[PDB]
């Protein structure tokens, strides 16, 4: 078994995790403060760059 | 020093051994080499260069020569020659023109079949120079374009960790930066695989073979390393010819394979000029790396047979472990692994690199058409206009000088900004890194910026590292390597021998700190130095194995990090804030030096070109508040223009005033006018307030600082803020659109200041809503409904075909007009298709300080103006002076940014003169200061470099030796504390507090442009929602965030008022502002634009979206 092994044969499920996970991401950092409009002290690097 | 120079004593014990160097010479050289200059071929012949080449031709002989595909005739370009410019810096600024000047080229055609020969000058037309202050003046901007920061080609060696099964793998990538790629890794498998333009991995012994390598040859010299005679036994290629065949049968499978066309392709592939090129810095690198073909000078653009076998040696060589190698034909170099971080290999693309590439792809684009038209023309007829193009050679140059990130606007903001930003090193742009990427690996500080990059100065916005400024003692190496100047040490004794070093040429050595002490003769005193190795470390070593010496202790800051005063007892995210703030100071009206400050505050006002300094000496022959005349010594006359009441690209007032009279001797490069922020010369950004550190009834509570009227009534800290104003008249299909006094529907006393044509008089006040200059359009259908019908029959006024479109003040903005501007096309101006006038008006107004306006220090100390005192509320000295500022104690300690303090007791020593009781003897404090600074009288300025100021025990030695006020009593005791009465009870305060003098700056973050609100106004086109991103009319994001917190209070009513009501609901929205101006309650809210808008695209798209109860 240990020389058979797995080849993970056409995981498709597994990519649409991985986009499911990076579509959510996208939404995360969207979700937080853009430059458009800041009212810090002055204009800090924010996660997004 | 410089001929002017006000007496400024300094508190540096050590000796400068090398002047600062031009600040302004990275902008300038580079253009200097671009373009060929006199003086420029005189500098590099006199540093060891023979024939040495400018810019321009060397992209003129790449070019150079031509030859058509049949072969019978030839053109090519020589000799750049350069005349003179079309106009003056200030006329071009005033037309909106661009200052360049007219390039000749002289070119020759020679046809083959017969021997005629052509020779005649080509106009290439307009190339944009630069003034003396390295700005490009384009459309009548002044821009700058900023130093690349790119990853120098050549051949670079890595070994990582494999994940899957432990050990490592050794792999070397040659990138040419012109050229495709060619790689040889290690795998787990002992082997050595090649793989030619990343394609699939190939055994190295075929190449070797495909280059005419045989097997005897290869297991009689590769005979140290058994990875490659593994690979040779598992290589199944018998003959070089198989090599070749067996490449191009893997490399394009497709293409039937042949001999002759697999070793064309080879051929071609890399060694080749036209295909494959290493930009004449590869080589320079790969012959430092490899050690071949040393000393002679090279100008091959390929691989040298030697240099792949030289590299597949030392890869194995680095596998094997060996730390030293050396082939035949070369010199014996050391064996160890590179990374892309250090200096070695990150070379610097300045201005004149930054335009040569664009000259070169421009002129590539000119000879596809130029050989083009020869293929197609006829012989005998054809001159060299005829078969040249210049039109898209100025196209790419115009549109790198408009649209290239690189080039942008220069920060006009103060003299600091523009010195700053010229010597910017920027890691972005064109083949460089995206804004979001590399995080934390390209940004971070590399033991190699010492000397050739500030790490403490650097933006800390999105470009936070990828961003820098070089430092003091820094110039670019013509290859294009930051390299800085050493002291040479022999026998432990210092000498005068400054070399300039790379990053690599100092890995190979053991430099030393500037502040070590030295003998008088120049031997070391102590026996242990502390010294930097060549992994970026610092250690303790013996005198005599010290190399070379720093030149000064303020080797590592830039310009602007060296004007911070006590920099070494400030923390570094502190002095990186106070730097950074120190570029954003508005000019005042009344400029002021500061009373204590470092030895930059001179040159970094002279180098920026903000002042006038007279080119030769002379004698003044008249001053005036306009221009400058004076009367050489050889009876050449000479004046300067003073540009008086300038707006800088920022809105800030930019203005000089003479500092000479009549009369006055003035030796060269002495300053005879001053610019905005600096005074007698010296850079004078901020101002110097009496300061008291106390918390005061809680009116500074959290970094909020208290301010007296005093600064409100004297302008103390008032500036000029000018803003532009352009409107345009043009045709339309209706009708041209015309400026006119006239205006309808409108009464006669609101235009009373406009002038006969319709604009407004200069010299009038002007406030928001008013107009400034008239303008009507054309309408059209009117359709009056019978509403307006009656009324205007009513009152008689007939209908209009004309709308008013008048320029009117943005709201918020206030002042004078002091200049108004007219172009038209009944003139010959230049404006754009279509547009007929165009009108600008700029209106100057006078902002005093106010609450809220931002102001700081120099070490990060920030703060908003939360209130204002009266003159008799705020705390004053026994002898009556009311403090002028008054900064919080709590906030002090925790930053960690105790240089303030230190400035303040400095100040306070400096404002009140001081005498040590010298006469007795020297103090034991008092024996190391320089005998000039034994005493000086009241208003004294001096001077703390930076990282060899004064010590605290000097500091604290003078705080009790200050002399007495006009009364005969000291304020301030010898803890640097003084007691105050308070203002509004007058009892005196229980305890001393710390009063001194400090220097603060205005900040350009006023209130008066940071404050928005909105009613109702425009709306998006689309999303019918609120439209933002101005100040005039932009509304306020709610984001999701606050909405949580909305559903968190268990606010419904409100988050659906205020998701639908005031944001794209159109139906409801009307209802809501009747209601209100009627007095009426406010209705129940509909559904919004968001949600009928989505169910009407759902239901597009075939799906039954229904609702139901
Ligand atoms: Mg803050």
Redesign the interface.
């Known amino acids: 078994v240990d020389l058979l092994g797995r080849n993970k044969a056409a995981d498709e499920a597994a990519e649409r995790e991985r986009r499911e996970e990076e579509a959510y991401a996208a939404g995360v950092l969207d979700?937080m403060?853009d430059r458009?409009?800041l009212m810090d002290?002055?204009?800090?690097?924010?996660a997004?760059? | 020093s410089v001929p002017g120079a006000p007496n400024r004593v300094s508190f540096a014990k050590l000796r400068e051994p090398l002047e600062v160097p031009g600040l302004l010479d990275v902008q300038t050289d580079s253009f200097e080499w671009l373009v060929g200059s006199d003086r420029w071929r005189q500098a590099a012949i006199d540093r060891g260069e023979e024939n040495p080449v400018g810019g321009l031709e060397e992209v003129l002989a790449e070019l150079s020569p031509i030859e058509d595909f049949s072969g019978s005739m030839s053109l090519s370009f020589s000799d750049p020659r350069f005349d003179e410019v079309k106009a003056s810096v200030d006329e071009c600024k005033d037309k909106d023109m661009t200052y360049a000047a007219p390039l000749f080229v002289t070119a020759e055609f020679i046809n083959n079949n017969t021997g005629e020969i052509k020779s005649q000058t080509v106009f290439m037309g307009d190339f944009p120079m630069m003034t003396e202050k390295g700005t490009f003046i384009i459309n009548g901007t002044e821009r700058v374009v900023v130093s690349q920061l790119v990853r120098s080609p050549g051949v670079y060696f890595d070994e990582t960790i494999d994940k899957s099964t432990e050990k490592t793998l050794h792999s070397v990538k040659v990138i040419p930066g012109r050229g495709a790629w060619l790689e040889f890794d290690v795998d787990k498998r002992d082997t050595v695989g090649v793989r030619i333009d990343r394609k699939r991995r190939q055994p190295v012994t075929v190449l070797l073979k495909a280059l005419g390598w045989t097997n005897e040859q290869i297991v009689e010299r590769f005979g140290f390393s058994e990875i490659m005679m593994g690979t040779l036994e598992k290589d199944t290629t018998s003959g070089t010819d198989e090599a070749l065949l067996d490449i191009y049968r893997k490399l394009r499978p497709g293409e039937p394979p042949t001999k002759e066309s697999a070793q064309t392709l080879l051929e071609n592939l890399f060694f080749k000029e036209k295909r494959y090129d290493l930009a004449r810095v590869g080589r320079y690198k790969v012959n430092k790396k490899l050690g071949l073909n040393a000393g002679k000078p090279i100008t091959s653009s390929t691989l040298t047979e030697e240099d792949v076998v030289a590299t597949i040696e030392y890869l194995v060589r680095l596998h094997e472990g060996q730390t030293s190698m050396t082939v035949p034909g070369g010199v014996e170099v050391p064996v160890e692994v590179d990374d892309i971080d250090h200096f070695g290999n990150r070379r610097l693309r300045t201005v004149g690199e930054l335009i040569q590439n664009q000259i070169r792809v421009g002129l590539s684009r000119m000879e596809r058409v130029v050989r083009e038209r020869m293929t197609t023309q006829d012989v005998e007829a054809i001159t060299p206009q005829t078969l040249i193009n210049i039109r898209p050679v100025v196209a790419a140059i115009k549109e790198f000088f408009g649209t290239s990130q690189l080039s942008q606007f220069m920060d006009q903001n103060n003299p600091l900004s523009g010195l700053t930003h010229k010597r910017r090193l920027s890691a972005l742009g064109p083949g460089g890194l995206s804004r979001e990427r590399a995080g934390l690996e390209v940004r971070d500080v590399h033991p190699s910026h010492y000397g050739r990059m500030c790490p403490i100065e650097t933006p800390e916005g999105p470009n936070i590292g990828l961003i820098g400024s070089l430092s003091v003692y820094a110039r670019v190496n013509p290859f294009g390597f930051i390299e800085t100047p050493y002291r040479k040490v022999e026998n432990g004794v210092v000498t005068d021998q400054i070399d300039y070093l790379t990053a690599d040429e100092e890995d190979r050595h053991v430099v030393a700190q500037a502040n070590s002490p030295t003998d008088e003769n120049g031997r070391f005193t102590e026996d242990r130095v502390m010294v930097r190795k060549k992994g970026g470390e610092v250690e303790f070593v013996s005198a005599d194995q010290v190399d070379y010496m720093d030149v000064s202790p303020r080797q590592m800051v830039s310009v602007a990090t060296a004007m911070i005063p006590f920099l070494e007892h400030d923390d570094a995210n502190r002095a990186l804030m106070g730097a950074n703030m120190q570029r954003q100071a508005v000019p005042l009206v009344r400029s002021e030096a500061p009373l204590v400050g470092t030895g930059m505050e001179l040159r970094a006002a002279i180098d920026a070109g903000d002042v006038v300094v007279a080119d030769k000496t002379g004698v003044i022959e008249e001053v005036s508040a306009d221009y400058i005349t004076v009367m050489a010594d050889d009876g050449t006359r000479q004046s300067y223009r003073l540009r008086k009441f300038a707006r800088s690209n920022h809105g800030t007032c930019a203005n000089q005033r003479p500092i000479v009279d009549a009369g006055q001797r003035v030796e060269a490069g002495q300053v005879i006018a001053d610019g905005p922020c600096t005074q007698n010369g010296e850079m004078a950004l901020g101002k110097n307030l009496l300061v008291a550190i106390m918390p005061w009834e809680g009116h500074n509570y959290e970094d909020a600082i208290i301010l007296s009227n005093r600064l409100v009534e004297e302008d103390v800290l008032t500036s000029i803020h000018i803003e532009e104003h352009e409107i345009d008249a043009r045709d339309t299909k209706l009708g041209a659109e015309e400026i006119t006094r006239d205006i309808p529907n409108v009464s006669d006393e609101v235009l009373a200041d406009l002038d006969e044509r319709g604009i407004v008089r200069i010299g009038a006040e002007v406030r928001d809503g008013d107009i400034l200059v008239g303008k009507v359009t054309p309408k059209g259908e009117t359709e009056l409904t019978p509403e307006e019908r009656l009324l205007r029959a009513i009152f008689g006024e007939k209908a209009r075909e004309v709308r008013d479109t008048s320029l009117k003040v943005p709201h918020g903005e206030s002042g004078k007009v002091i200049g108004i501007r007219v172009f038209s096309r009944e003139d010959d101006d230049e404006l754009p298709a279509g547009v007929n006038e165009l009108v600008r008006v700029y209106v100057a107004q006078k902002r005093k300080i106010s609450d809220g306006d931002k102001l700081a220090g120099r070490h990060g100390n920030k703060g908003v103006i939360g209130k204002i005192l009266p003159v008799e509320d705020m705390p004053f000295l026994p002898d009556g002076t009311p403090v002028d500022i008054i900064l919080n104690t709590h906030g002090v300690p925790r930053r960690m940014n105790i240089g303030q303090i230190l400035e303040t007791h400095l100040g306070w020593v400096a404002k009140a003169g001081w005498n040590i009781d010298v006469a007795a003897g020297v103090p034991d404090w008092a024996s190391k200061l320089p005998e000039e600074l034994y005493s000086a009288p009241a208003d004294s300025t001096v001077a703390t470099p930076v990282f060899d100021g004064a010590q605290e025990g000097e500091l604290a030695g003078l705080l009790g030796s200050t002399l007495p006020n006009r009364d005969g009593e000291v304020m301030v005791d010898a803890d640097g504390k003084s007691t105050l009465f308070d203002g509004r009870s007058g009892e005196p305060f229980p305890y001393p507090v710390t009063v001194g003098y400090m220097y603060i700056l205005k900040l350009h973050h006023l209130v008066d442009d940071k404050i928005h609100a909105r009613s109702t106004g425009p709306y998006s086109m689309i999303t019918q929602q609120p439209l933002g991103g101005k100040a005039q009319f932009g509304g306020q994001r709610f984001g999701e965030m606050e909405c949580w917190a909305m559903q968190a209070y268990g606010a419904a009513y409100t988050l659906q008022e205020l998701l639908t009501i005031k944001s794209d609901d159109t139906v409801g929205r009307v209802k809501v502002y009747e209601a209100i101006v009627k007095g009426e309650n406010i209705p129940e809210p509909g559904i919004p634009e968001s949600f009928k808008v989505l169910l009407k695209e759902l239901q597009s798209l075939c799906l039954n979206v229904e609702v139901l109860s």
């Open positions: 979700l403060v458009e409009d002290d002055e204009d800090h690097l924010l997004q760059d």
